[PDB]
Design an enzyme around this catalytic site. Structure first.
Site: not given
Ligand SMILES: COc1cc(/C=C/C(=O)O)cc(OC)c1O
Ligand SMILES: *[C@@H]1O[C@H](CO)[C@@H](O)[C@H](O)[C@H]1NC(C)=O
Ligand SMILES: *[C@@H]1O[C@H](CO)[C@@H](O)[C@H](O)[C@H]1NC(C)=O
Length: 275
Positions: A118-120
């Site tokens: 998720s994200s990064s």
């Protein structure tokens, strides 16, 4: 079963932590799924954030590996030549070493190694896809950024990166994004893992413009156009774009969803061929 730490998995150029979840009943030659936390998070935090993943491991007998970053505000390095490049070093190489440790110690199936984040962590899942297609069979990136966007950035965090990528200010052609993927491993001759990307239209942290850029990137890598679209799939407001014959790239845009798109374990596990 619960989560436990691996103190020594071998060479660790990213200086990362390794946490593992092994179900009580393992498949014969189990699959491995690397699950990657977001900025300011942790391996233990992502284990409790995606509450559906460990029960799915219990039911299907695969192993979960949660790498942990303690550098750069607990963000994954998606910026250095080392992390971006096949056999370069930093976090991506440490994660691959975690994978090799797991396959060797638990007699895992090296053809069933996957990653999600998720994200990064989504950003790193695409780094692993481009730089280690010889290791990973499939990736699922929730609310990330196209591979190579942060190349040369002085960091990979909200407080250290060039913010152009997170702000959605970087736009490149499909061909240029494909060229970026090839730069992860110059001279690589082979195929790339199945890629599944997700993004929410209301994401105020990572601009949804990055979804368009990821679509350009991986449609170019596989040489495919959109061939089928499913509305409200798997949830109301989620538009599923299916590319080519559906075997290499699919993408989900979630109306009204922000940072981040919640992991859809069924959709991601089916993409990986595990259910
Ligand atoms: C790579 O550079 C960045 C990563 C993230 C990651 C956020 C997260 O993982 O939750 C956020 C950024 O600005 C908001 C940013 O510039
Ligand atoms: C790709 O093929 C070329 C020859 O066509 C070879 O020189 C090169 O080593 C191959 N790449 C890899 C990563 O093995
Ligand atoms: C994708 O679309 C472009 C633009 O219409 C087209 O030129 C190309 O041949 C298509 N690729 C396919 C159908 O594989």
């Amino acid at each position: 079963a619960t989560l436990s730490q691996v103190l020594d998995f071998g060479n660790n150029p990213g200086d990362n932590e390794m946490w593992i979840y092994v179900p009580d009943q393992l498949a014969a030659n189990p699959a491995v799924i690397v699950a990657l936390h977001g900025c300011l998070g942790s391996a233990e935090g992502y284990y409790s954030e995606v509450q559906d993943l460990p029960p799915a491991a219990d039911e299907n007998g695969f192993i979960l590996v949660y790498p942990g970053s303690n550098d750069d505000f607990h963000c994954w390095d998606v910026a250095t030549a080392e992390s971006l490049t096949h056999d370069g070093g930093s976090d991506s190489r440490s994660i691959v070493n975690m994978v090799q440790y797991t396959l060797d110690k638990y007699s895992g199936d090296s053809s069933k190694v996957f990653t999600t984040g998720s994200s990064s962590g989504a950003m790193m899942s695409l780094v692993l896809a481009a730089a280690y297609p010889d290791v990973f069979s499939g990736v699922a990136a929730y609310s990330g950024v196209p591979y190579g966007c942060l190349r040369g950035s002085p960091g990979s965090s909200p407080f250290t990166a060039d913010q152009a990528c997170a702000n959605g200010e970087v736009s490149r052609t499909a061909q240029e994004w494909k060229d970026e993927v090839k730069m992860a491993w110059p001279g690589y001759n082979g195929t790339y893992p199945k890629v599944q990307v997700w993004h929410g239209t209301a994401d105020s942290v990572i601009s949804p413009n990055n979804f368009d850029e990821e679509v350009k990137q991986w449609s170019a890598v596989f040489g495919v156009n959109v061939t089928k679209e499913e509305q409200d799939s798997p949830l109301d407001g989620y538009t599923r774009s299916i590319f080519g014959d559906g075997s290499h790239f699919e993408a989900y845009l979630a109306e009204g969803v922000g940072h981040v798109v919640p992991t859809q374990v069924d959709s991601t596990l089916r993409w990986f061929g595990l259910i």
